[model samples]
Target chain A: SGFRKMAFPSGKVEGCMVQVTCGTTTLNGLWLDDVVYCPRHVICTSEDMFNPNYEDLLIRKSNHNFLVQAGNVQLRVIGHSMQNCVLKLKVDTANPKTPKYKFVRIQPGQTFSVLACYNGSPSGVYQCAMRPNFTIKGSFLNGSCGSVGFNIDYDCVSFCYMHHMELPTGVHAGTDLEGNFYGPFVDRQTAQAAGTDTTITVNVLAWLYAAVINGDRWFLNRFTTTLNDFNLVAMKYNYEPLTQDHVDILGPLSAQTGIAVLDMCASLKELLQNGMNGRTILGSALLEDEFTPFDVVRQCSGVTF
Target chain B: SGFRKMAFPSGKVEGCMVQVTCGTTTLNGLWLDDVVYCPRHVICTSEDMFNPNYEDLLIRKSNHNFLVQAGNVQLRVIGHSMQNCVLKLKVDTANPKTPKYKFVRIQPGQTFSVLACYNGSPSGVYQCAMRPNFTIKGSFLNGSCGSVGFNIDYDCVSFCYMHHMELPTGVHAGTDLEGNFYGPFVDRQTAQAAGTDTTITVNVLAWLYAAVINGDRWFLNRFTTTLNDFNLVAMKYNYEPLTQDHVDILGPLSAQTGIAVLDMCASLKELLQNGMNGRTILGSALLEDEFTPFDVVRQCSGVTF
Candidate 1:
C-alpha cells in the first residue's frame, strides 16, 4: 500500500499523499494546505468518502486559484495525424460524474500555456480530452512548484468523445473519454455574465470576429501567434518575486500578497515548464507514450510533432 | 444654390443633385431612393427642414445602411504632430441634437474601409470630428457607387470633445467638435446584446484584449496589422456583383437581390474616396485646409501622412 502521512512545510509538498478526514469519513489524497499549494490536479473527497480507490479523490479545475508559486508552464501537445485537433482538461468540482473545461483548438507542435502562479494549474494526470473522437494518452512529464517552470509534456488530442463537430456557433460542448456529451457548461462567473453562445461550431467563428475588433495586442499576438513575450507575462501573471517601477505599478497592492527557496526555484521550476530550457525539449513527440492515444488506435505513424 | 432635382434610371443618382422633403416639411438633402446609395457620408434634414446651412442636412452615422453600390472605399487618416489620435462618425436617428458613432482608434496613414454596397454609406459633406482636441478637414474628393470602388478619404483623429481619456474599460464614448461628453453609445442591435462597457477610457484596453483571444485571423490580421486583405473584403462587403462558390456559400440568398450604369462609375467614385485615387492623395496634410486643426492654432508642420 502506498499510503502514508507526510508533513509539508508551510509551502512545497513533496508530491506525497496526505491524510485528511472526509467529514464523516477518511481517505488519503492530495489536500490543499492552510496556505496556497500548487495548482491542483486531483482534489480529495469522493462520493462514499471511505473509498480510497480515487473515490477518495475527485478531479478539480486546474488553475492558479490555490497556488503560492509564480512562473510559467507550457504543455507540449504532441502532434498527431488524426482528425482529433481540439483539446481540453477534464475536471469536476461537486460531482465526479461530469467534469469540464472549454475546448481549445490545437495544432501539432502547439503549446498551451499554464501561468503556474497565474492562469493554470500544476501538472498531474489529466483525462486530457479531445474531439473528432479524439484519444489522448493522458500522462505527465516532469514538474514542480519550486523553481522556474517550463515544459510539462502531455498527450493532447481527441479520442474519447464522439459529439457531432457540425454544431452552430455560440454553443459550448464537452465530453468524456467514453463519449459523453456534457450539457452546456456555465458556472458561477459565466452565469453572472452574458448569455451563453447558442452554437459551438459557428460560435468558434463568432468569437474569432469579436476578438479582432477588441483584444490585447501584446497578449493576443503572443498567445495566438508566437511566444515572443511568453516569459515576461507568465512571470507577471504568476505573481513575480520582484517589481519596483513595476512594484510601484502594483502600488500598495504589491505588499498585500506573496516567497524564495520558492523564489530560488522560481527559474529552475519555471524553466522545467519549457520542453527545452537549457537542453531544450525541442522536436516532436518521439516517445511512444507521447502519442499513446492514436498511439494505440493506429493512425499509422504518430511522427507528426 | 446647391439644390437641384435630377432624374435617375431607377438606380445611379448622379452627383448632380437630389430633391427630397421631411415628413411634413421640405428641404434639400441626400435621399436613399428605391435602391442602395453609396456608403453615405452626409444625409440631409435639419430641425425646421428649411435651413440649408447643414440644417437641411443633419449628421448621420456613416455605414452601409442604405447603399446599392458594390465596391470598397478607404479613408486615409493623415497623421499629425499632436496627441489627438482617435476618430469617429457622428449620427442621429430620431433626434439630431445628439448625433453619434463609436470612436475608432487611429494612427496617421491608418485607413478605414467603406464597403460601398456592404458596410458603409455613400460619400458626401458632413462635419468630421476627432479627439485630443482633434480636428478633421471633413471634405470630399469624388465618389459614385459604380463598378469598382476604391479610396474615400477622411481626416481621422481626436479633438471634437474633451472627455477624459482615462476611464475604466467597457464604456463607449463620443462627442462633437465643441467638446460634448455624450453618454454611452448603444444602438438597437447592441442594446439587445450584452451589457454596456463600464467606462470609456479603459474600455479601449478592454476591447483590445478581448479581440486577441477570439478574432478572425484573416480579417483581424489585416484590419489590425496591414492593408493585406483590404480590397478583398471591402468589395465582398459591398455586395460585389460577383461571387460563385462564394455565393453558393450564401445558398439561396441571391436572386432575391438586384444594378449597373453605376457600375461604369464604380472605380471612378470609390477611388475618389482616395485623396489621390489616380492622382494619389499621398503624403500628409499639405494645403492649408488639410491641417486645418492646429492648421490655425500653429503646432508646427501638420505634415505627417
Candidate 2:
C-alpha cells in the first residue's frame, strides 16, 4: 500500500548476527554474505562451518593472503614456512594502548580462526600482522609473518537503496514540469487530441533551460574542474574514452533538430567516442550558454598528448 | 508570435563590417565591440578620428599592448626605450609565405597605422611579436621588441542567446519530456487538483532511477574512475571538500523519506564541497546495488587527507 512495501529484504541469514564496535559506538547486523535460510530443518555438524571451497579460496598463496570470515569480522593471517614455528598475531589500531595479541601454532593443512579478545579488541578498521619465530636448532629467526594485503571495516551499514520510477506508470504518466502529469494515451491520436503531444515537445527544452538558469554556477564550475582533473587521470592510465559502438548501444532519444541543443548533444556523443581526445566544434559555448556542449578540449586544453 | 519572436537582438555597429579569414574560410560580420546607433546629423572630421580617450587607452604601456583600431583591423605597436628607434612588426600565422613584415619609424608621441599587405592579410585570430632594432650608434642592436602576451581572435561570433520560461508566462506552459508545451496554471489550487502535485514529486525520483538503470555501464565505470582520479587532484591542490554551509545553500527541495535517493543527493552535495575530495557514502550505488549507500569510502576510500 505504501513505499515501504516495495522494500527488498536482506539476503543474509537472520541468525547470523555480528556486533561491530568502532571506538565506543557499536553496530549490530547480519553479515552481508552469510546465509540464513534453507527449505528444511537440518542437524548442525562440525563440518558445516568448515565447508569452504579451500581450492578456490586459496587464490593468493603469498604473504598473509588468507582471510577467515567469522560472522561480522574478517580475520587476516600472515604465513611463513611453518614446519615448526611459533606465530604471534598482533592487531593494530589507532587506539593508543597495548595492541590485542594472541598466540597460535599451525601445521601445513591447518586453518585457524583468530580469537576475539578484549581489554579490549581494537575498534574501527584494524590490521593484523602475524609474526613468526622459528626456534629451530636452538636459534631464533624472528620477523614479520607477512600478512595479506587487506584491511577490515568494523562498522558497515547497508541502506535499502531502492530506486523506483513512479512516473510513466501508464500511457500518460508524465509531467510537463509545470507540475502536471498526464498519460496512458493509448495512441498518437489520443495523446495529440489530449494535447499531450504538444506538451511533451516543449517539456524537454524547458527543463534544460530551467537547469541552466537555476543551476548553481559554482556547481557547474566544480563540475568542469573535476572533468579537467580527470583528463590527466585517463592519460595516466593510458585509457582511452569509449567508442561509437559504446555510444550507439544507447544513443540519444532525440533527433538532429539543428538547434544548439541537438548540436551540443551530437558533439558530446562524438567527443565521447574519441576517449576525450578530439576537437569540439562547440568550444567556448561549453564554458557558458545553456544547451552548449561540454568543452572536452578545454577540460585538458593545455595538456599535451 | 513564435519562439523566434521571443529571441533577443544583437549589439553591433550598423555599417562596420569585417571579412574574417580562418585558413581558407571567411566569415564576414561587424566587430565585436562596435556600436550600432545614435540620433544626430553632423559632419565628421580628423579630430573625431583622433579622439580616443588616450588616458584610458594608454593603460597598458608594454610592447604590442598599444592597439590602433583601423576600419576592420587593429594594428599593434611594439615598444622601444624612447623617441628614436627602428621597430619591426611581424605577422604570425600558420601560412609560411610572406610571414607579413613591416618596418616603422616613430616620433615622441606618435600614432601609426600598420599597412594592409599580401599575398593577403590573415583575417582570423593572430599572434604577433615585435622586434626592436635600435641603431643608437649606427650599429644594429637587434633583439626582441618585447611584445605583450596576447592573441587576437577576429572572428568573434555572438549568438543572440535568450531564454523564456514560456509555461510560466501565465504560470502554465511546459511539457512531459516531449515537444509539446503546457501550463499557465491559472491558480495553484487548480494545478494541485490536476495531480501535478504528485507528479512533480514522483517525476524527479523516476528520472534519477531511469538514469541509474539506463545509463551506460562504461559511463559509470569512467565516472567512478574519474572520481577516484580526482581524489589525488584535490589533494595535490590542497583543496578541501565542500562544507555543510555549501550544502545548505542548495539543499534538496523534497523532504527525505529514508530512501537512498535523498541520501545520495546528500552525499553528492557533500562531495562537491571539498572540490570533490570527501569520501562519497554513495559508492557501489554509483556502480549499482539495490540497498547500498554509495560506498563513499571505496570511491576513494584509501585516499589520505
Candidate 3:
C-alpha cells in the first residue's frame, strides 16, 4: 500500500467528521470505493477500519456553522481533527435509557448541518447532549467528544418562531399568510434581516390567552369599538375602512411573518427534555393534548400557510 | 251683581289651586280678565275683600290631591279655612332671602302644576317647610301649614331622571334620545322598566370607562383576536362577523337606548336639594367646577353624540 497514515496532533485532532464529495454532489456517507482511486495518494490506511456507509454530510464548509431556518436548536462544529475522518450526529430523545443516533458524516474541509429530520432520527432535550464520534486511521473514535450542556434550555434548534392570529389592526412586523418569502426563519439574524419589516409584533397570542382564560368579554368589545372608531375617523378623512383586500395589498411582509398559521415549530427544550413525548412546551394543562405551545405561536404569528 | 260668597268647606277645601281654562288652551300664567265673571252667581264675596288677579293657582277638592307632571319641589295645600280663598306659591332660591309669592286663586277642583318659572318667585328648599298664605276678608292669612320635615334628603321632586349613552352592545333597558318615549321618565318604576333592557348595562358602562381611561393598547389586540376566533368558528355555519349594520337589524331596542346624546336629566336630588347648583351627585372633588360629575358619567357611558 502506498497510503500514509496521518498522525493526530494530540488535542487538536480530538473531534473530527468526514464529508466525501464526488465532483459537485456531496454524498451523505463516504466509502473507500466511493473516493477516486488516485494511485499516487490513496488517502487510506485500511478499508476494514471505515464503516463504508454514512448519512447527513455537510456539502458546503462556510455555510455549516449556522442555524436551521426553522427550529429551536443550534448545531455548531466546535473544531475538527484528522484529514480523513468520519463524524456522525445523534440525538437521544429517550429518558433514562437507550441512545438512538442519526448521523451525518463530514469530510476534512467541510462542516456539518444538524437537521430536524436526520436519516435514522426522523423526530427528535433539557438534559439532552449531542455526542460526536469520528473515525481515523484504521479505527473509529466513537464516543462523546464533549457535550453542549444547558442551563436554562435544551434541545436547541436554529429557527425563528412565528405566531399567528386574526388581528384587527395591521402590525408592521406581520405578513399575510398568502404569499411570503423569508419566514418563518430559524434564527433571529435571518428573521430580523428578512422575516418581517417590524422588529416586534403585537403580542396577540398572549392577549388571546388572557382573554379566554380570564373570561373577559370586554376585551372583544374594546377591539370592535376601537376599530369601528378608527374606521369612522377614516371615513371622516375620506378614507375607507381596512378591508381584506387592503390587507392583501398592504405588503408581502404580512404573508411572510404575521399571516396566521395553524402550526409552529415546537420548542427545542420540549422535544429534547421531554423526549418528544408528545407533551408540548405550553404544557398539557392549558390546551388539549392535540395542540402544542407552538400552535399558539403559529396562531399569534399568523403562520397559517 | 247678585253674587253669592261661597264659604270655605273648612278642612275639605284646604289645598286648592285655580286652573283657569278659557276654552281649553291651558295657559302658563293667568290674567285677571281670563276668568268668566258671572253676574247672577258671582261666586264672589267682598265681605273681608281680596283682589282676584293671580297666576298658577292650585285648585283642589279631593280629586286634585295627586302629584304634578313636572317640577323640582312640591307645594302642597295644607288646609283651607274659607271659600273663595286665594293661595300663592313662593320660593327663596337664595340663602337668607325674602319670600315674595306668586298668588293663584283656587276655584274648586283642578290639580296645579308648579312650573319652574312663576311671577314674583324667580327660582326654587331644604329642611322642607312650606308657608301657606291665603286671602280672606280683603286680607292675607300667612302661616306655616306645618312642615313635612325629613331626616334625610330635602326639597324632594316628584319626577325621575334619565341617563343617556352610546353602548357597543345591546342592552335591554336603554333608550335612544329620539322619541322612543318610555325613557326620560321620572321614578325608578319607569326607568327600570324601560331604561335598560338588562341590568348588565351598568357593567358595560364601567367597562367602557376602563377601556377609555386605560388606553392599554393590548386590550384592543385581545378583543380582536378573540372575536376573530369566534367568527372563524361561526363561519363554519355561514355566519358573518358582527357588524354595525347588523346592530341596527339586531333590534330597535339598541337604537332606542344605546344611541349617544349630550343632554341627560340631572338627578332630582341635584335639582331640588342642591338647587340645580350644577353639583352632580358625584360631588365636587372628582371634577372641576365647570364640569359636573355628570360629565364623568357621560364619559363613562361613552356619551359622545
Better of 1 and 2 by lDDT: 1
**TM-score of chain A, predicted model 1, versus the true chain A, to 2 decimals:** 0.17
TM-score preference between candidates 2 and 3, better one: 2
DockQ of each: 0.01, 0.01, 0.00
Error of 3 at B91 (Å): 96
**Candidate 1's residue-wise lDDT over B1-305, tens digit each?**
00001000111211212222223221112222121111111232234213323321323322332222212322221211111111122122221111122223442211122111101222211112222222221111112111111112121222122222212232223222222333432111123222221111111111122222222111121113112233343343332222233223222211211111122123222422342211211111111111221211111111111
**Which runs in model 3 stand beyond 4 Å of their true positions?**
A1-206, A214-294, A297-305, B1-305
On a 0 to 100 scale, what is the lDDT of residue B160 in model 1? Answer: 22
Best lDDT goes to which candidate?
Answer: 1
The regions of model 2 sitting more than 4 angstroms off are: A1-305, B1-241, B257-305
Poorest 10 consecutive residues by lDDT, candidate 1 chain B: B1-10
lDDT per residue, candidate 3, B24-125, as tens digits? Answer: 122111111111111110122232114322122223222123111112333232332111222122212221211122222221111111111111110101
C-alpha TM-score for every candidate: 0.16, 0.16, 0.14
Model 3 agreement with the true structure over A44-146: per-residue lDDT tens digits: 2234114322112233233233111112222332322122222222212211211122222221111111111111111000011111111110100111111
User: Against the true chain A, what TM-score does chain A of candidate 3 give?
Assistant: 0.19
